[PDB]
C-alpha cells in the first residue's frame, strides 16, 4: 500500500534532534542516493558444572513452606516426640468422636487401591523412586498421599513427614486438596494445602501435604527442597512439559541424596521409559473391578439412530457390511466439525436402552461446550425434568465443577460435556454411556509468524481407549466414537509430548536461575529430549531481551525475569513501566493476560456498557484498566456493592478478584528485587481527557505484544507482518457494532495473540501512533532518505532525522534498563540525563505529537 504520511510538527522535530545531541546518541546519517537504503537500528563467570538442587529432611523448627524458621509459639522448641505424640492423639480423638468423618473412612477402604496400601508403603520405605501404575479411578491421587501420612502418624513419626504432589493442571491442584481436607475432616490449611500460580493455602509446617503446579514448585526451589521427605509427581502420562522438565532434576537430586522419597503415578501405559529413566526403579501395579465396554464408530453411530446430515477425508470410506444410506450420510460430515446434531440423537438412542446412567461427553474445548450445551436447551426435551446438563473445563466455578459428582433425582440423566480432564485426571461415578468427539485441543505456537493456533486436532488410539474406559467402572458400557473405522486406522498410538512442539524460554530462564548448566546441555538429559530448533530459538529470544548475556549467562535483568511467572517479554515491560512510574498499570496488563477476559460477552460483539470502558483510545487494553478503576472504586462498598456493579455491567468478579491478587504478587517480587514502593502506586487515569501516565502505558504495551502489529485497510480487515491479511476480532472494542464504520485517526494497531482458525484474527486490540510503531514496536527500519520502510512489510513517509532520532530514543531506553536492572533505585535519583530522554518519549507517546486529538471526531 501506499506510504503513511506521519504528520510531526518542526517543534517536535527539533526537540528529537536536540535531545539525541545533548546526550550524545549515536544517530545513522542520510543515504547518498535512494537505491542504497541505510538501517537507523546499531560478561560474568561462566561455569560448564552440571549443578544439583540440594535436598535436606523435616525438621520441627523449619516451615518448609514458608522456607522460614519457626520463631514464635510452642513449635520453636518443642521436639519431633512431642509433636508427633500431639498429631497422634488429635487424629485418634477426631476419628473417635465424628461419626461423618468415620462414613468417609468407610468410603476410603473400598477404593481399589485400599488392598495395595502395604505394598505401596513397604517400597517407598525400601526405594528411593517408585512407579505406581493403574487404571484411572483406583484411588491413586487422593489416597496415597494420605497412606504415606497416616504411616508417619500411626507409627508416632509425624514430625518426619512432609509432602509435596505435583498435578500438571491447576485445576487438579486446587481441587485435589480439597477433596484430601474433605476426606480428613478439614478445608484446606491444616494437614493439606494448595500452591498455583498467584494462588495458595500453606498447609500447617509438620506432618502436612502441599498440592501444587510444577511451575510454583520450581520458582520456590532456589534455595532447595528444604524440609521435604517425599516428592509425589503425579499424572506423567500426560508428558506435561514442566513434569518432564521436573524429572531431570529430581533424578539428579535422588543421586546426590538417596534418603528422598519420589513416587511417579501413571495410568496404564508402558512406563519402561520412566522406568529406566530412574535406573530400572520397581513399578507397583494397581487394578480393581472393570466391566467390558461395547464401542462403535460414526457409521455405528449413524445406522443406530437413522440419523441424516443436513444438506483425505475417511467419511467417503465404509465397509461393504453397512447400509448405503449409513456411506451416504456418513460421506456428508466434514471431519473438521463436530456434528452436534448426531450427539442429540444418541442422547435419545441411550433412552431407550432403559439401563440408567450418566453420559460423559468429551469435546476439544470451552468453545464447542458452549455451543453443545446452548443447542441442547433449544429442544425442551433436554429440561430439568429429564435431562440434568453440566459442563466441565478448567474456567467453569468450582462451585459448579463439584456438580458432576453428585448423585441426581430418579429419572433425570447426567450429561457432562467435559475437555480431556475427565481422561485420566478425575473419575465421574455413575457413567455408563461416553461420546468420544475424538478430537484434543492444543496450543501450537510458530515462532517466524507468531501465529498461535488453539487447533483442533485427532486423539490418540492411546486417547481413544482412556476414554471408552470411563464407560466401565460402574456396569457393562458403551463408547460412542464420532470419527469412521477408517480415521480410527490413521491415528498415531500417542499425542506428540509437549516438550516436542512448545516454546522452551521459560524452562531455559529456570535451568539458569537454579544453576542446573547449559541450557542445551541440560535439556539433552530429559527423558525425551526437544528439538535442536526449539533450545535455539529460546536462546535467540532471551539473548534480544537481554535475559542471556554473550556468554550465554543470566543477566541481572534474565534473574528478575526468570522471578516473575509471565512471559519473560512482559516481565522486560514492567521492568520499563517501574522506570516510568507507571508499574501499577503495567502489572495490571500482565496479569491479565494469565485470566480469561473479564468481559461476559457470549462471543458475540460487545454491546453499548463494555464499550463505553474503551473512552476515545479505541483500545481493548484501555477497556481493561478503566473495568479495574471502576471495579476497584464499587468494592468500597463493599460485597454487595461489588456483586452488584459485576452484574449490572456484565462482568466476571472472580476473574477481576485472581487477576487484582497477581497484580499484587507480581509487584511484590518487583519490591523485593530493590524496585521502589512510589514508581508502583495505583493511579487515577481518564480513558477520555489528556493522560500522559496512559499513553506511556500503551507505548509500552507495543513493546510487550511486539511483533504483533498490523495495518487496517477497511471494515474488519487488516494487514499483519508477513504483508498477509486478516480481520479483527468480533470481541474487540475496534469491531465495527453494526454497519457505522470507525474513523480510526491512526490505522496503526498491537494486539495480544495472532489467532489461527479459518482466518487470521487479532485479539484484544489497542490503536498506536506512528512515532509508537517506531519507538517500540520495530526491530529494523531502513531509510531512503524520504520513506522509511519498517520491519520490511509497512512504510512511513516520515523525515531521516526524526525516524533515527526515534530509533537512539529506543537504544538509550535499553541501556537504561540494563543499567537499573544492575541498581534498581536508581528509579528513585530521577538522574537529569535519564530524565531528559524519559521525558522525550514521554513527549512522543502524546496523540498530539503524532497529530491526532482523540475527544475531536
Ligand atoms: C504466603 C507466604 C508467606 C511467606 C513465604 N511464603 C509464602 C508462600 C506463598 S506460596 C508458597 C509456596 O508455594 N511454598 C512452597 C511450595 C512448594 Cl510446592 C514447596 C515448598 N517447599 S520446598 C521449596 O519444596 O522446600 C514451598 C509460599
Ligand atoms: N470431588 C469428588 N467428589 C466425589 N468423589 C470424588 C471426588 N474426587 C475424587 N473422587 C473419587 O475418588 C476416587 C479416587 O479418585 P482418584 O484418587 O483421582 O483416582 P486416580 O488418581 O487413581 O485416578 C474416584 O472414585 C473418584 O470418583
Ligand atoms: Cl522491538
Ligand atoms: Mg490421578
Same mark, same amino acid.
Given at each position: 500500500?501506499?506510504?503513511?504520511?506521519?504528520?510531526?510538527?518542526?517543534?517536535?522535530?527539533?526537540?528529537?534532534?536536540?535531545?539525541?545531541?545533548?546526550?550524545?546518541?549515536?544517530?545513522?546519517?542520510?543515504?547518498?542516493?535512494?537505491?542504497?537504503?541505510?538501517?537507523?537500528?546499531?560478561?560474568?563467570?561462566?561455569?560448564?558444572?552440571?549443578?544439583?538442587?540440594?535436598?535436606?529432611?523435616?525438621?520441627?523448627?523449619?516451615?518448609?513452606?514458608?522456607?522460614?524458621?519457626?520463631?514464635?509459639?510452642?513449635?520453636?522448641?518443642?521436639?519431633?516426640?512431642?509433636?508427633?505424640?500431639?498429631?497422634?492423639?488429635?487424629?485418634?480423638?477426631?476419628?473417635?468422636?465424628?461419626?461423618?468423618?468415620?462414613?468417609?473412612?468407610?468410603?476410603?477402604?473400598?477404593?481399589?487401591?485400599?488392598?495395595?496400601?502395604?505394598?505401596?508403603?513397604?517400597?517407598?520405605?525400601?526405594?528411593?523412586?517408585?512407579?505406581?501404575?493403574?487404571?484411572?479411578?483406583?484411588?491413586?491421587?487422593?489416597?496415597?498421599?494420605?497412606?504415606?501420612?497416616?504411616?508417619?502418624?500411626?507409627?508416632?513419626?509425624?514430625?518426619?513427614?512432609?509432602?509435596?504432589?505435583?498435578?500438571?493442571?491447576?485445576?487438579?491442584?486446587?481441587?485435589?486438596?480439597?477433596?484430601?481436607?474433605?476426606?480428613?475432616?478439614?478445608?484446606?490449611?491444616?494437614?493439606?494445602?494448595?500452591?498455583?500460580?498467584?494462588?495458595?493455602?500453606?498447609?500447617?509446617?509438620?506432618?502436612?501435604?502441599?498440592?501444587?503446579?510444577?511451575?510454583?514448585?520450581?520458582?520456590?526451589?532456589?534455595?532447595?527442597?528444604?524440609?521435604?521427605?517425599?516428592?509425589?509427581?503425579?499424572?506423567?502420562?500426560?508428558?506435561?512439559?514442566?513434569?518432564?522438565?521436573?524429572?531431570?532434576?529430581?533424578?539428579?537430586?535422588?543421586?546426590?541424596?538417596?534418603?528422598?522419597?519420589?513416587?511417579?503415578?501413571?495410568?496404564?501405559?508402558?512406563?519402561?521409559?520412566?522406568?529406566?529413566?530412574?535406573?530400572?526403579?520397581?513399578?507397583?501395579?494397581?487394578?480393581?473391578?472393570?466391566?467390558?465396554?461395547?464401542?462403535?464408530?460414526?457409521?455405528?453411530?449413524?445406522?443406530?439412530?437413522?440419523?441424516?446430515?443436513?444438506?483425505?477425508?475417511?467419511?467417503?470410506?465404509?465397509?461393504?457390511?453397512?447400509?448405503?444410506?449409513?456411506?451416504?450420510?456418513?460421506?456428508?460430515?466434514?471431519?473438521?466439525?463436530?456434528?452436534?446434531?448426531?450427539?442429540?440423537?444418541?442422547?435419545?438412542?441411550?433412552?431407550?436402552?432403559?439401563?440408567?446412567?450418566?453420559?460423559?461427553?468429551?469435546?476439544?474445548?470451552?468453545?464447542?461446550?458452549?455451543?453443545?450445551?446452548?443447542?441442547?436447551?433449544?429442544?425442551?426435551?433436554?429440561?430439568?425434568?429429564?435431562?440434568?446438563?453440566?459442563?466441565?473445563?478448567?474456567?467453569?466455578?468450582?462451585?459448579?465443577?463439584?456438580?458432576?459428582?453428585?448423585?441426581?433425582?430418579?429419572?433425570?440423566?447426567?450429561?457432562?460435556?467435559?475437555?480431556?480432564?475427565?481422561?485420566?485426571?478425575?473419575?465421574?461415578?455413575?457413567?455408563?454411556?461416553?461420546?468420544?468427539?475424538?478430537?484434543?485441543?492444543?496450543?501450537?505456537?510458530?515462532?517466524?509468524?507468531?501465529?498461535?493456533?488453539?487447533?483442533?486436532?485427532?486423539?490418540?488410539?492411546?486417547?481413544?481407549?482412556?476414554?471408552?474406559?470411563?464407560?466401565?467402572?460402574?456396569?457393562?458400557?458403551?463408547?460412542?466414537?464420532?470419527?469412521?473405522?477408517?480415521?480410527?486406522?490413521?491415528?498415531?498410538?500417542?499425542?506428540?509430548?509437549?516438550?516436542?512442539?512448545?516454546? $522452551?524460554? /521459560?524452562?531455559?530462564?529456570?535451568?539458569?536461575?537454579?544453576? *542446573?548448566?547449559?541450557? %542445551?546441555?541440560? =535439556? @539433552? !538429559?530429559?527423558?525425551?529430549?526437544?528439538?535442536?530448533?526449539?533450545?535455539?530459538?529460546?536462546?535467540?529470544? $532471551?539473548? /534480544?531481551?537481554?535475559?542471556?548475556?554473550?556468554?550465554?549467562? *543470566?543477566?541481572?535483568? %534474565?534473574?528478575? =525475569? @526468570? !522471578?516473575?511467572?509471565?512471559?519473560?517479554?512482559?516481565?522486560?515491560?514492567?521492568?520499563?513501566?517501574?522506570?516510568?512510574?507507571?508499574?501499577?498499570?503495567?502489572?495490571?496488563?500482565?496479569?491479565?493476560?494469565?485470566?480469561?477476559?473479564?468481559?461476559?460477552?457470549?462471543?458475540?460483539?460487545?454491546?453499548?456498557?463494555?464499550?463505553?470502558?474503551?473512552?476515545?483510545?479505541?483500545?481493548?487494553?484501555?477497556?481493561?484498566?478503566?473495568?479495574?478503576?471502576?471495579?476497584?472504586?464499587?468494592?468500597?462498598?463493599?460485597?454487595?456493592?461489588?456483586?452488584?456493579?459485576?452484574?449490572?455491567?456484565?462482568?466476571?468478579?472472580?476473574?477481576?478478584?485472581?487477576?487484582?491478587?497477581?497484580?499484587?504478587?507480581?509487584?511484590?517480587?518487583?519490591?523485593?528485587?530493590?524496585?521502589?514502593?512510589?514508581?508502583?502506586?495505583?493511579?487515577?487515569?481518564?480513558?477520555?481527557?489528556?493522560?500522559?501516565?496512559?499513553?506511556?502505558?500503551?507505548?509500552?504495551?507495543?513493546?510487550?505484544?511486539?511483533?504483533?502489529?498490523?495495518?487496517?485497510?477497511?471494515?474488519?480487515?487488516?494487514?499483519?507482518?508477513?504483508?498477509?491479511?486478516?480481520?479483527?476480532?468480533?470481541?474487540?472494542?475496534?469491531?465495527?457494532?453494526?454497519?457505522?464504520?470507525?474513523?480510526?485517526?491512526?490505522?496503526?494497531?498491537?494486539?495480544?495473540?495472532?489467532?489461527?482458525?479459518?482466518?487470521?484474527?487479532?485479539?484484544?486490540?489497542?490503536?498506536?501512533?506512528?512515532?509508537?510503531?517506531?519507538?517500540?514496536?520495530?526491530?529494523?527500519?531502513?531509510?531512503?532518505?524520504?520513506?522509511?520502510?519498517?520491519?520490511?512489510?509497512?512504510?512511513?513517509?516520515?523525515?531521516?532525522?526524526?525516524?533515527?532520532?526515534?530509533?537512539?530514543?529506543?537504544?538509550?531506553?535499553?541501556?537504561?534498563?540494563?543499567?537499573?536492572?544492575?541498581?534498581?533505585?536508581?528509579?528513585?535519583?530521577?538522574?537529569?540525563?535519564?530524565?531528559?530522554?524519559?521525558?522525550?518519549?514521554?513527549?512522543?507517546?502524546?496523540?498530539?505529537?503524532?497529530?491526532?486529538?482523540?475527544?475531536?471526531?
Amino acid at each position: 500500500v501506499e506510504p503513511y504520511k506521519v504528520n510531526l510538527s518542526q517543534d517536535l522535530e527539533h526537540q528529537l534532534q536536540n535531545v539525541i545531541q545533548e546526550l550524545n546518541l549515536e544517530i545513522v546519517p542520510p543515504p547518498e542516493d535512494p537505491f542504497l537504503p541505510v538501517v537507523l537500528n546499531l560478561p560474568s563467570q561462566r561455569q560448564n558444572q552440571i549443578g544439583v538442587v540440594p535436598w535436606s529432611p523435616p525438621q520441627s523448627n523449619w516451615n518448609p513452606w514458608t522456607s522460614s524458621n519457626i520463631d514464635e509459639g510452642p513449635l520453636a522448641y518443642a521436639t519431633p516426640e512431642q509433636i508427633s505424640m500431639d498429631l497422634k492423639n488429635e487424629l485418634m480423638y477426631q476419628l473417635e468422636q465424628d461419626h461423618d468423618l468415620q462414613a468417609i473412612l468407610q468410603e476410603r477402604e473400598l477404593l481399589p487401591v485400599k488392598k495395595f496400601e502395604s505394598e505401596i508403603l513397604e517400597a517407598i520405605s525400601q526405594n528411593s523412586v517408585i512407579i505406581i501404575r493403574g487404571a484411572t479411578g483406583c484411588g491413586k491421587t487422593t489416597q496415597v498421599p494420605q497412606f504415606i501420612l497416616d504411616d508417619f502418624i500411626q507409627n508416632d513419626r509425624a514430625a518426619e513427614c512432609n509432602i509435596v504432589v505435583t498435578q500438571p493442571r491447576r485445576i487438579s491442584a486446587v481441587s485435589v486438596a480439597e477433596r484430601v481436607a474433605y476426606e480428613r475432616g478439614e478445608e484446606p490449611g491444616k494437614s493439606c494445602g494448595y500452591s498455583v500460580r498467584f494462588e495458595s493455602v500453606l498447609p500447617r509446617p509438620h506432618a502436612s501435604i502441599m498440592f501444587c503446579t510444577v511451575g510454583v514448585l520450581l520458582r520456590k526451589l532456589e534455595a532447595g527442597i528444604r524440609g521435604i521427605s517425599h516428592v509425589i509427581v503425579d499424572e506423567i502420562h500426560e508428558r506435561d512439559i514442566n513434569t518432564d522438565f521436573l524429572l531431570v532434576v529430581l533424578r539428579d537430586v535422588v543421586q546426590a541424596y538417596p534418603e528422598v522419597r519420589i513416587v511417579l503415578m501413571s495410568a496404564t501405559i508402558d512406563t519402561s521409559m520412566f522406568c529406566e529413566y530412574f535406573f530400572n526403579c520397581p513399578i507397583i501395579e494397581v487394578y480393581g473391578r472393570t466391566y467390558p465396554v461395547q464401542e462403535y464408530f460414526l457409521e455405528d453411530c449413524i445406522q443406530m439412530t437413522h440419523f441424516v446430515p443436513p444438506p483425505a477425508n475417511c467419511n467417503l470410506i465404509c465397509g461393504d457390511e453397512y447400509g448405503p444410506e449409513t456411506r451416504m450420510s456418513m460421506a456428508q460430515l466434514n471431519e473438521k466439525e463436530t456434528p452436534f446434531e448426531l450427539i442429540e440423537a444418541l442422547l435419545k438412542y441411550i433412552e431407550t436402552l432403559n439401563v440408567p446412567g450418566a453420559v460423559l461427553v468429551f469435546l476439544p474445548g470451552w468453545n464447542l461446550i458452549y455451543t453443545m450445551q446452548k443447542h441442547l436447551e433449544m429442544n425442551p426435551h433436554f429440561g430439568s425434568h429429564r435431562y440434568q446438563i453440566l459442563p466441565l473445563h478448567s474456567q467453569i466455578p468450582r462451585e459448579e465443577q463439584r456438580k458432576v459428582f453428585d448423585p441426581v433425582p430418579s429419572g433425570v440423566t447426567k450429561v457432562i460435556l467435559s475437555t480431556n480432564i475427565a481422561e485420566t485426571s478425575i473419575t465421574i461415578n455413575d457413567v455408563v454411556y461416553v461420546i468420544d468427539s475424538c478430537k484434543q485441543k492444543v496450543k501450537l505456537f510458530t515462532a517466524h509468524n507468531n501465529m498461535t493456533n488453539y487447533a483442533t486436532v485427532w486423539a490418540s488410539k492411546t486417547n481413544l481407549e482412556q476414554r471408552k474406559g470411563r464407560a466401565g467402572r460402574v456396569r457393562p458400557g458403551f463408547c460412542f466414537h464420532l470419527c469412521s473405522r477408517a480415521r480410527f486406522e490413521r491415528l498415531e498410538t500417542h499425542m506428540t509430548p509437549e516438550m516436542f512442539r512448545t516454546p $522452551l524460554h /521459560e524452562i531455559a530462564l529456570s535451568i539458569k536461575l537454579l544453576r *542446573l548448566g547449559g541450557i %542445551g546441555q541440560f =535439556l @539433552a !538429559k530429559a527423558i525425551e529430549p526437544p528439538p535442536l530448533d526449539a533450545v535455539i530459538e529460546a536462546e535467540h529470544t $532471551l539473548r /534480544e531481551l537481554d535475559a542471556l548475556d554473550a556468554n550465554d549467562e *543470566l543477566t541481572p535483568l %534474565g534473574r528478575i =525475569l @526468570a !522471578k516473575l511467572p509471565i512471559e519473560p517479554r512482559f516481565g522486560k515491560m514492567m521492568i520499563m513501566g517501574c522506570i516510568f512510574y507507571v508499574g501499577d498499570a503495567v502489572c495490571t496488563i500482565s496479569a491479565a493476560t494469565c485470566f480469561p477476559e473479564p468481559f461476559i460477552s457470549e462471543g458475540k460483539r460487545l454491546g453499548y456498557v463494555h464499550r463505553n470502558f474503551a473512552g476515545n483510545r479505541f483500545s481493548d487494553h484501555v477497556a481493561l484498566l478503566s473495568v479495574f478503576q471502576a471495579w476497584d472504586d464499587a468494592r468500597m462498598g463493599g460485597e454487595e456493592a461489588e456483586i452488584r456493579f459485576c452484574e449490572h455491567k456484565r462482568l466476571n468478579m472472580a476473574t477481576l478478584r485472581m487477576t487484582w491478587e497477581a497484580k499484587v504478587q507480581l509487584k511484590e517480587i518487583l519490591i523485593n528485587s530493590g524496585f521502589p514502593e512510589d514508581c508502583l502506586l495505583t493511579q487515577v487515569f481518564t480513558n477520555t481527557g489528556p493522560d500522559n501516565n496512559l499513553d506511556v502505558v500503551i507505548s509500552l504495551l507495543a513493546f510487550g505484544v511486539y511483533p504483533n502489529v498490523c495495518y487496517h485497510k477497511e471494515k474488519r480487515k487488516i494487514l499483519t507482518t508477513e504483508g498477509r491479511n486478516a480481520l479483527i476480532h468480533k470481541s474487540s472494542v475496534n469491531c465495527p457494532f453494526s454497519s457505522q464504520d470507525m474513523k480510526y485517526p491512526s490505522p496503526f494497531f498491537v494486539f495480544g495473540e495472532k489467532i489461527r482458525t479459518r482466518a487470521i484474527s487479532a485479539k484484544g486490540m489497542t490503536l498506536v501512533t506512528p512515532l509508537q510503531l517506531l519507538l517500540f514496536a520495530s526491530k529494523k527500519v531502513q531509510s531512503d532518505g524520504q520513506i522509511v520502510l519498517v520491519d520490511d512489510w509497512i512504510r512511513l513517509q516520515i523525515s531521516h532525522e526524526a525516524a533515527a532520532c526515534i530509533t537512539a530514543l529506543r537504544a538509550a531506553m535499553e541501556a537504561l534498563v540494563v543499567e537499573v536492572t544492575k541498581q534498581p533505585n536508581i528509579i528513585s535519583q530521577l538522574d537529569p540525563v535519564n530524565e531528559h530522554m524519559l521525558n522525550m518519549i514521554r513527549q512522543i507517546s502524546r496523540p498530539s505529537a503524532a497529530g491526532i486529538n482523540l475527544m475531536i471526531d
